[PDB]
């Protein structure tokens, strides 16, 4: 543990943008669309759509852990705390060679296979006051979620019920205890954001996450259901996360696509409501894969040698 006090700001961490740009390049040579559409305007309103048609090799994109080590003249500083805002002065900082193995999982609403929170469930936000800034939740206990190209994912209704609780309790523990916590589905927007999208076996899954984000701080939802089953759907025509524009991938082919990921975190986003009565409504969020990265680099910061 380095004997000194430095400043950290995961929300302005540059490694995020360094990994992000990398993950994209890790996508341009692994998942190539049969066609990629992208805006192209000179500013004169009129916007032609630049189109690109390349080969569409069906490859079961299987993310590999990525280590980030500082070269020369550079050193990586890590922060150590059971609960770090990730945006302030760290006391138990410590220099490290490479950051922990991170599996660049690109997804929305749920953070899959990330890194759990040591102590308890921690939620970070560049500004909880601003109903526009995404709230990155960090789970201390992952919730296995099994998705299949067959058309759905199964989640433990038990585990997910607890999670929403040990999250709903951490929310008010930041917005006001005398405040009712509620969870509603996506407000609207792109399919990739409205549902819990992500890629499995190179297939872009789109799971309707309503049953996961329709929790009321009153009743339950385990009548005749042991496990939660999200009606997922694989799409060919999708909105690119790497950059504004659609992209069409070739249809599925492998006799079977399966995913067993750990819900290690979420990306929520409460609605302002113009300071209305105690009834904060949090809905799924995400879509800006950088937040994902952030949730993994929240406690890091590369710095120049001295």
């Amino acid at each position: 543990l380095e004997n000194v006090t430095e400043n950290f700001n995961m929300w302005k961490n540059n490694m995020v943008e360094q990994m992000h740009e990398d993950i994209i390049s890790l996508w341009d040579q692994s998942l190539k669309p049969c066609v990629k559409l992208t805006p192209l305007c000179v500013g004169a309103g009129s916007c032609n759509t630049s189109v690109i048609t390349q080969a569409c090799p069906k490859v079961s994109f299987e993310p590999i852990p990525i280590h980030y080590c500082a070269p020369a003249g550079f050193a990586i500083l890590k922060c150590n705390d059971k609960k770090f805002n990730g945006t302030g002065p760290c006391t138990n900082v410590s220099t490290v060679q490479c950051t922990h193995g991170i599996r660049p999982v690109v997804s929305t609403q749920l953070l899959l296979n990330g890194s759990l929170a040591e102590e308890e469930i921690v939620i970070r936000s560049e500004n909880f006051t601003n109903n526009a800034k995404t709230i990155i939740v960090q789970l201390n206990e992952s919730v296995v979620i099994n998705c299949t190209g067959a058309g759905h994912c199964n989640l433990s209704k038990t585990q997910w019920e607890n999670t929403l609780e040990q999250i709903a309790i951490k929310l008010k523990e930041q917005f006001g205890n005398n405040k009712t916590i509620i969870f509603n589905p996506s407000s609207g927007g792109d399919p990739e954001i409205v549902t819990h999208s992500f890629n499995c076996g190179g297939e872009f899954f789109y799971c309707n996450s309503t049953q996961l984000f329709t929790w009321n701080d009153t009743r339950k939802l385990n009548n005749t259901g042991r496990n939660i089953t999200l009606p997922c759907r694989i799409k060919q025509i999708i909105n690119m996360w790497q950059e504004v524009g659609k992209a069409m991938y070739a249809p599925p082919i492998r006799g079977q696509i399966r995913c067993s990921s750990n819900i290690t975190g979420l990306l929520l986003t409460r609605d302002g409501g113009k300071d209305t009565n105690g009834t904060e409504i949090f809905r799924p969020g995400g879509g800006d894969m950088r937040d994902n990265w952030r949730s993994e680099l929240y406690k890091y910061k590369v710095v120049k040698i001295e």
Partner: antibody
Amino acid sequence: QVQLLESGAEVKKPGSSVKVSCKASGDTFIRYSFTWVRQAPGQGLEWMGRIITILDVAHYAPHLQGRVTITADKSTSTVYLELRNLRSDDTAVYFCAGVYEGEADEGEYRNNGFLKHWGQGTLVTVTS
Amino acid sequence: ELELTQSPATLSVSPGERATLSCRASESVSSDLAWYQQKPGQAPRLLIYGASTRATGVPARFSGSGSGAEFTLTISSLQSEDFAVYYCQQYNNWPPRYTFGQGTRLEIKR
């Protein structure tokens, strides 16, 4: 159950440009990808190109790239095939053809090459 | 640049008997092969596609087999209405550069 209707046979002259229409009806337009297949008298089918309607992207045949274009009007539900710099050999029966692609309006797309639904066919005579 | 050729330029056979068509192809086209049937003065007819699968609403006498660069649209007891030129379409490469066969006339032999 789509039914494809084509524009009338046209008699364009060498070096001109012809535009054949193809009205699609009986189902969801954007769920289909249309292809133009031309056939010269006595000759056989020749793939001219296909338009992934929904995406509004089209790809053409090598020996035609540059002088051919395929567009669709989702509004009126029509597909068009334009050939510029017409020649006598271009004289042929230009068939309009399409195939279902799946819930394309929902992101699903089979991107099929074969053609299930064909048009009545439009003849184009290019001569002096 | 696929050269899909249908060796049997012309096949003379009698009604009720069995007719066989072969579509030779350049590089492999996997299973992205279709078969068509064209009556004089009519738009083609999607018979088979994906190599071995008949199109919705088509006589079972038309059997489609093959995979790679050797496909066969074999027909059991032929039919009077089965007279027509048959075409094989390839739609495997991508970008889109589909090609048709040069054809095959299934004429009646008397």
